């Protein structure tokens, strides 16, 4: 079974928003669908469910007035007049006994900042040399580095972003052999999916 | 709302080893038709939950049975026979037989393994970036173990406090160390004022700093 989720949405306070839920690989009719909240460094929190059949729906005393659970083979979501409490991971899954299947989850970021595209550097100074991708001042957070378009994932350390002055910083790095570089060159690519960016950087000495 | 509780918050257990998370409810899991529905989940950095054992001691599709559950009422215990570098994630138990569906809080599962010096690497700015009158100079510290280790940044012999970022990684799933990038921020004009830029790293493995630095 699969069940295909947004990914990520910026949401402004106050706003509204509709996460949607696709099922496939199965009946969709013949389970109940939930809903789960996840922040970041948090448990889990369970939110709600909807039966496909018909649309009989039952939630959570503190999501009763967040939520509002109907479908379609999609099943959606809505949260109302959000705020950055609500900043968040959710996911819709079907939780029944050996029938467990997840989204990957919507991270959800209510936030009034404005959506800013990376600056990529290059980062280019033994038997191994490290290399590495500068990517800073974007939001919101997301953003995916890959080195030779994922071919190369062995010695790859991916570092989590930090917020310096209001904007996302990361970085990563790759480890090839010596005698490789710069013979052969790696090259970082950077997607950033929320302002539709998608910027290689060749390493050179 | 049935609270679940988990023990301990943290555990650090070698490969090979033998791991027991518990979990208690502040009321019992019996169902009035019988069933116990008490699961756990393992959550991978990045991933979303996936479920191992449901109730109490089944086990979903695929896992192996070095995972198996115990317990009752209020008490459960998930056990790792032989703990293996893939273990690694955060363990969450929780129960389906109250309504609302409530979860516990967590355990994050830490490999032990034997000490290792982070190999470090310097980079100055790039010309893409001076060119645009930022400077930030970047170490990468990695592959150690353990991962409290101690960063400074040295601008001609004068220790650097402010504008300085750290992030550390997650615990490696293939070799259980650590990484972390120290990045110094200055502007293009404090930069070009000075000669060597140095990254000073005090860790277990050494008594002297590791030491890597850079003359412009
Ligand atoms: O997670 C759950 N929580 C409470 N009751 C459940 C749940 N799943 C199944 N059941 C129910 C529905 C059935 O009539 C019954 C036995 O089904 P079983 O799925 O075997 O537990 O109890
Ligand atoms: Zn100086």
């Known amino acids: 079974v699969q069940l295909q989720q947004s990914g990520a949405e910026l949401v402004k306070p106050g706003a509204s928003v509709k996460l949607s839920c696709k099922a496939s690989?199965?009946?969709?009719?013949?389970?109940?669908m939930q809903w789960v909240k996840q922040r970041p460094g948090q448990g889990l929190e369970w939110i709600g469910e909807?039966?496909?059949?018909?649309?009989?729906?039952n939630y959570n005393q503190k999501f009763k007035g967040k939520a509002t659970l109907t479908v379609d083979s999609t099943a959606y979501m809505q949260l109302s007049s959000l705020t950055s409490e609500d900043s968040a991971v959710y996911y819709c899954?079907?939780?029944?006994?050996?029938?467990?299947?997840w989204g990957q989850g919507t991270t959800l970021t209510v936030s009034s900042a404005k959506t800013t595209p990376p600056s990529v550097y290059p980062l280019a100074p033994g038997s191994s040399v490290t290399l590495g991708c500068l990517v800073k001042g974007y939001f919101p957070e997301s953003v995916t580095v890959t080195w030779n378009s994922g071919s190369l994932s062995s010695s790859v350390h991916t570092f989590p972003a930090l917020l310096q002055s209001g904007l996302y910083t990361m970085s990563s790095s790759v480890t090839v052999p010596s005698s490789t570089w710069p013979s052969q060159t790696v090259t970082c690519s950077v997607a950033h999916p929320a302002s539709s960016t998608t910027v290689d950087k060749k390493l050179e000495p | 709302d049935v609270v679940m509780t988990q023990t301990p918050l943290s555990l650090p257990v070698s490969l090979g080893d033998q791991a027991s998370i518990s979990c208690r409810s502040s009321?019992?899991?019996?169902?009035?038709?019988?069933?116990?529905?008490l699961h756990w989940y393992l959550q991978k950095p990045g991933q979303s939950p996936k479920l191992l054992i449901y109730?109490?001691?089944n086990r979903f599709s695929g896992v192996p049975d070095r995972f198996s559950g115990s317990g009752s009422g209020t008490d459960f215990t998930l056990k790792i026979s032989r703990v293996e570098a893939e273990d690694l994630g955060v363990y969450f138990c929780?129960?389906?037989?109250?309504?609302?569906?409530?979860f516990g809080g967590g355990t994050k599962l830490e490999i032990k393994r034997a000490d290792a010096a982070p190999t470090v690497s310097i980079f100055p700015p790039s010309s893409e970036q001076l060119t645009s009158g930022g400077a930030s100079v970047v170490c990468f510290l990695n592959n150690f173990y353990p991962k409290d280790i101690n960063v400074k940044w040295k601008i001609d012999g004068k220790e650097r406090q402010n504008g300085v970022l750290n992030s550390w990684t997650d615990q490696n799933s293939k070799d259980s160390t650590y990484s972390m990038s120290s990045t110094l921020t200055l502007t293009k004009d404090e930069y070009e004022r000075h000669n060597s830029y140095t990254c000073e790293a005090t860790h277990k493995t050494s008594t002297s700093p590791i030491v890597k630095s850079f003359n412009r």
């Open positions: 909807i039966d496909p059949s018909d649309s009989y729906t």
């Open positions: 009321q019992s899991l019996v169902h009035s038709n019988g069933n116990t529905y």
């Open positions: 690989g199965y009946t969709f009719t013949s389970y109940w």
């Open positions: 929780s129960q389906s037989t109250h309504v609302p569906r409530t």
């Open positions: 109730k109490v001691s």
């Open positions: 899954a079907n939780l029944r006994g050996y029938f467990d299947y």
